[PDB]
Amino acid sequence: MKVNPFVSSDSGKSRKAHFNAPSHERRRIMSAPLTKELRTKHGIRAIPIRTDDEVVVMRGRHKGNTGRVLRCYRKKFVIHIDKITREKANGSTVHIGIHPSKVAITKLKLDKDRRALVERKAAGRSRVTGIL
Amino acid sequence: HAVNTKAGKQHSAESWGTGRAVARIPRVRGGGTHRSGQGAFGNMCRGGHMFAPLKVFRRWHRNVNIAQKRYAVSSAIAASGIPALLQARGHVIDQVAEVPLVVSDKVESFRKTKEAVVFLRRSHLWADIEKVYNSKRNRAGKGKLRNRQHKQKLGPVVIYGQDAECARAFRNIPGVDVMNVERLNLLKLAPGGHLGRLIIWTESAFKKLDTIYGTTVANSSQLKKGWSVPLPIMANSDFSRIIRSEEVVKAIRAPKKNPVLPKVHRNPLKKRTLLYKLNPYASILRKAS
Amino acid sequence: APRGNQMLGNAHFRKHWHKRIKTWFDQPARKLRRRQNRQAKAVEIAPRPVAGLLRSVVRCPQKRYNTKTRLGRGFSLQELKAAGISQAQARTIGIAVDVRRTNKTAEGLKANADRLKEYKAKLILFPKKASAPKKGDSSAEELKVAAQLRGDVLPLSHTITFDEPRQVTDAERKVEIFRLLRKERADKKYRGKREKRAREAAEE
RNA sequence: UUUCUAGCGAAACCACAGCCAAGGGAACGGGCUUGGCAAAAAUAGCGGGGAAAGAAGACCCUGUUGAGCUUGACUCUAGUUU
RNA sequence: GCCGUUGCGACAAGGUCGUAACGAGUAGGAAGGUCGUGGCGGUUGCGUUGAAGGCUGAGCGUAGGCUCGGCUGGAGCUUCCGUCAGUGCAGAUCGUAAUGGUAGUAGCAAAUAUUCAAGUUCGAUCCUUGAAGACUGAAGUGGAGAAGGGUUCCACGUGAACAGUAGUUGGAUGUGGGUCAGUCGAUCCUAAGGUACUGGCGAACGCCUUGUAUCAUCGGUGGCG
RNA sequence: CAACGUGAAUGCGAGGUCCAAGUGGGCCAUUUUUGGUAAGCAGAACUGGCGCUGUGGGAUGAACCAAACGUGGAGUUAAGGU
RNA sequence: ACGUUUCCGACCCGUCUUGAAACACGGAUUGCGGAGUGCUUGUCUACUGCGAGUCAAAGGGUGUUAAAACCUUGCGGCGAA
RNA sequence: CUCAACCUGAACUCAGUCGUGAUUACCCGCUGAACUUAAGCAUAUCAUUUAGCGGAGGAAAAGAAACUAAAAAGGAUUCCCUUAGUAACGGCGAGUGAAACGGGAAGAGCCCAGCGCCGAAUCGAUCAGUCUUUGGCUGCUUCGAAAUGUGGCGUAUAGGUGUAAGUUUCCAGCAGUGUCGUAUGUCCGAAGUCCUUACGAUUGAGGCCAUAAACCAGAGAGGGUGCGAGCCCCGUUCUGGAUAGCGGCACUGUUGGUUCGCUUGCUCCUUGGAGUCGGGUUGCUUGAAAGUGCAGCCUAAAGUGGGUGAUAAACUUCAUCUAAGGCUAAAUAUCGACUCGAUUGCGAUAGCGAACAAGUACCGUGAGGGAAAGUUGCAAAGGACUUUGAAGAGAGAGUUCAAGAGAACGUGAAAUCGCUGGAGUGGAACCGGAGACAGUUGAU
RNA sequence: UAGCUUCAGCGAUGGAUCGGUUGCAUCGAGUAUCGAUGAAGAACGCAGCUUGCUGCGUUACUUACCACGAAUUGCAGAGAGUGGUGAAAUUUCGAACGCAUAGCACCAACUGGGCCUCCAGUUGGUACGUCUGGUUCAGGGUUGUU
Secondary structure, X not given: OOOOOOOOOOXXXXXXXXXXXXXXXXXXXXXXXXXXXXXXXXOOOEEEOOOOOEEEEOOOOOOOOXXXXXXXXXXXXXXXXXXXXXXXXXXXXXXXXXXXXXXXXXXXXXXXXXXXXXXXXXXXXXXXXXXX | OOOOOOOOOOOOEEEOOOOOOOOOOEEEOOOOOOOOOOEOXXXXXXXXXXXXXXXXXXXXXXXXXXXXXXXHHHHHHHHHOOHHHHHHHOOOOOOOOOXXXXXXXXXXXXXXXXXXXXXXXHOOOHHXXXXXXXXXXXXXXXXXXXXXXXXXXXXXXXXXXXXXXXOHHHHOOOOXXXXXXXXXXXXXXXXXXXXXXXXXXXXXXXXXXHHHHOOOOOOOOOOOOXXXXXXXXXXXXXXHHHHHOHHHHHHOOOXXXXXXXXXXXXXXXXXXXXXXXXXXXXXXXXXXX | OOOOOOOOOOOOOOOOHHHOOOOOOOHHHHHHHHHHHHHHHHHHHOOOOOOOOEOOEEEXXXXXXXXXXXXXXXXXXXXXXXXXXXXXXXXHHOEOEOOOOOOOOHHHHHHHHHHHHHHHHHOOOOOOEOOEOOOOOOOOOOOOOOOOOOOOOOOXXXXXXXXXXXXXXXXXXXXXXXXXXXXXXXXXXXXXXXXXHHHHHHHO
């Protein structure tokens, strides 16, 4: 149970915040878990997904399909994965939106800032796991 | 809770009177919109004030006599010590060692939910929490929309006397409550107003009960001024032993059956044996004839 | 239209009372706010007593209450002089001064003088500069036991004692209490008439 | 114009409904009682009836309901004279 | 014979049973309701292998109502115990939304009037061209303006709606274009009149006077510069 | 204080307190009766009814005659009839 | 059983009214909404606790499943003349 | 008559300031109804209230007794409980209606005029230095205010002089050292998407060594994700950590200013608000009753005087304050504004008028009036293509768990209406009772 | 036969009901911050395509700076973009200020017209009341002096 008097357990307030979150907050919302091997390799459990990441679908009708994250449609709260497409009537191909919480990251697109972020998360995880 | 005091009265509405072939309800004024000429104000009208708008100064809270609160808490405690009442209230106590269930003060040193869960499992109290888990369900009705999404069973209550911050080990277990023996809450001792909550007493809490609630001697309670355990109105509370006692049996008279009545009236003027049973001389008279 | 045996109605609801309504839903909130204010004040002025100034003892005014005492506004200047405390010094060491009250009776003055004396006995004075103490300032190990006092300073005791049983004296029994009371009433009631009669007799 | 045709297309009103005689009934029935009778679906007219429709009678009375006006009604008042 | 009420009674039971008599009812009063509705504290369960809701066969109850079956539906619902209430509709010329018979009915009848051939079009009484016949008849059914409108102006598309028939046409609808001033007006002067200053009044927002009420209200030639 | 012992018929259990609803337009009939020419008129007395009430009969009818009502059955009738 | 057909019965509801099927008024049809409430003050009644007492106010102390619960009154209300 | 002062009054686009106008919940000052109740109605009531005008703040106002009272006395203001529906008022009708004492929250005291002493010891601009410069400090800067009196001491507790004892600093900034709060930003976090099964999709069902066991739990609040999730994600718990900023403290140093004072005894001296108070009368107002409060006009003071002690007046016992000048935090009111947390409330005819391009469309010349309107699906995958038609549209097809979810799209009631089959059908139709037929249903 | 009525089955018209819910109502808590440095409010304008709503002001669906760290999204398109927000900027009406109230006019400087007395442009300024001081004044109002 929550203890913070400034944190609201109101369903309406939570839903309003989620569906009116700005882009930088939707980034954090759209986070995906790492696979077991990646988790042991990098020390972290989950990270805010990013374009050019490799993922595997863990649930749904596309379970087991892999590919690269083509886009992060933060407005629609979905990601478009490579090779995960369907065909419209006319014949064009449209990417099927997947919620990042239903996929697992198999390779992290690392840059300067992503490396620093992973370092921070791993340091914090080690610090807390030591005390626990 | 209350409705807005101006709800349904924010219209400059006037009755049209008679002669217009319409009911004399006040009607919205103006023109050029659907609202114009529609009924207003009355509780029968769409968009008017409800009947007797609910006011904010209703009697919400109540004054409860301290003596009766203490009586209720004592009764709830006493009922917690009856195995049958706990079963009737739904707690699973099949393999519980003893009612009341007093445990060592070591439980007051618990600091991790792992330790608390192990203790509950080994005490054969986990059946109650398993039933609590199975009882979680969606609340039926509008409560779901008002931050009361789920309903679930209540588990045991752990009562402690000296807290080494033991309640932390128990908070997260569903249904399990934790209380301090000095401040015992009737709302947790008798949920829903029903008797027979399952209680786990620590040794210190059990030892402090006499100090807190006194005995049957007047003013025996030290922490509640002038309080003492209420006296019963019946000494022997079982109705069968009194009835079957030798003293009562001696005074009682032998049981009887429902009195028997003829029920059916026959016609001795038409039958033989009936008439001859009622008047044996009729047979002699007929013989003479 | 009242019917039958009823008490005649008295409800004062003929004004537009719906415009002036006061509820008490914030009673526990006010309790919490006042507790928090007291805590903040205690932190601010520690180690001084949270209650604040020391108040005086006072007899309740009218004969309906004159057998009871209570905390007054402050100490009269006569009491301060009797206790040997300057008014300026009292303001500094936290004693309330009632500049309007004056003492007309030795017992009342003495009770408050004794109260001031015990307060001075219980007082702990910190050195004005921690490095250098002076005369009057409390001693070093005395300054270690200093603790903030909560509640009234020198609270009053309201316990009732019972006089010890004694012997019924003969002179006590021979008194005529009712006759005495009626005589006193009559004397007060007829005092003026007798004076008028005396003046007329003198003039004749 | 109505009439018939093509196109277009409302409203009032409506407890349920619509053949009569007498009877009795809230003292003038479409319904009830006893009689006369009683055979689809319809078009154009009609103004006897539906105590036909329009409107909580503008007449009359009641209400301890008003308003306009008058004065020798009751109680006041601007103004003015002293 | 059965149901219930009342009285009485038996039984180790907030119950069952027995027995005798009895049963009209407006206004009204009480009682019972495992009659129904929505919350709360608890308790009992069901649910994408199908809840609520909806339509409707086999039953149950004197009744209020209830259970089950079948079909639709797609996410909630529920027993029992206390307690609470925005708790039950046929009416109120009730509020609101929708829909009937009337009824393919009343009706679409003032202002004289249209016809022939052709064009375009899937489609022409109604749009366009030509020929004819009529009308307004210069105090016009002509040509331009003021107030008002505000793009209705012009061109090219147009299927629906609107143009109380129709429509290929339109003041409709879609897309674009269009208003050029030293001389025409405004701008400038003052009329009736409005409104400021001060001045008085006013509890005050502010009012009253436009007047010798108020009032120290300037500006012109010339020299000098 | 002493003694006496229930003194017409028939029927039948009796008494007390409190809280409160609706009502405060009545109408009809045998008999008596006032005003009136009378009235399905106006006003009274006793009782019974309708209002509040169905049921058999008077063809029909608030009041008339019979009779008052849980829900069914068999038998017999009231007033009325064949 | 809201089908048909027979025999008997059978006037349209709500309302005001002495009296309504009325030639008295409202009602064309259907859905949904729609009216003895809140609070203050009395009084009686029922139930609960205690009982010459009872309830305690504002307040204070503590309480973090902290607007709750628990503790707390020379004094106040009603009662005891 | 010349020059020079002062007084009074002007003009300046002179140098530098300030006011105006919004907001409504609370706050302060005015002005001020009627409906209504009295079963009529005029005093009364509604009500010292809607409406109107003015003026502030985060609170405002009030506030340090010309008080309460009659004890063995209390002692500024504000607020709560109680007093109390009491005293009192009232066509003494309907109705109205306080306060002190008592228990509490909070508590904080002071400054002038006058008298007296020093007597211009005081102050604004400007100039020049100097600093930590949205402002301060220094002056032979130059002007001006001020003797019709600025400053210092000093105000009812009094005060001052001298004297004897004791006792003697305080403000403001700057930098550091720690100590502590932050509705202040940013960053950080424990454990299964494990096997079997179900599903369109799981979070649903079963299993995961062990006596006690899938694992975490100081985290089983909430939300999202294809209804169901502590363990998939954000989050939640850590009386959470890290970091930067703001603050509050405490101590050290430093800078600038400032301190001949304070208490008690004795000594001598000294000590106060006028068109005001009070009185008459008039009007309003109050529970205030021969006048509670306020105001107009007339009258108009005194100095142990003045006010008050609730029944008016003389004459007497006293008691208690010190009016006609001023400042002042807290407890209290209030969601109008900004930011938050909740709920036995409503669930789209409800709840604010407004869940939505709502004070919107629309209406009125104007003041102003004022709606209706939520829902495809997990995902548009929003129906390619063939075919008839000018087209609307239809017939096939495709997508989809599903389209009879097809765009006005969840469900899809009643009224009303069309078709197919059966049956009835002479100026109503419906309905209760009793059978028959058709039909439905049960039969170890 | 048809019509009419009725029953069973099917389909329309209509939008009730049910199921939640970023909305509303009420309660509580914490803060004190409008305006001549131009407020509240109004008008007009601003986007590649964007009427409305929302946002903004000629730097106009936003610039700078700081945090985070890869998007926006209907189509395009190319330290992103979000958040914080201390720098800059903030149209016209409006207390609304030159006078009037939908118009016209005065003072300076500078620039161009070739020069300029005349035009045009740009920039600064011209409101009412009031306080302090300054300058220039008026009055036999009182007074001195020649």
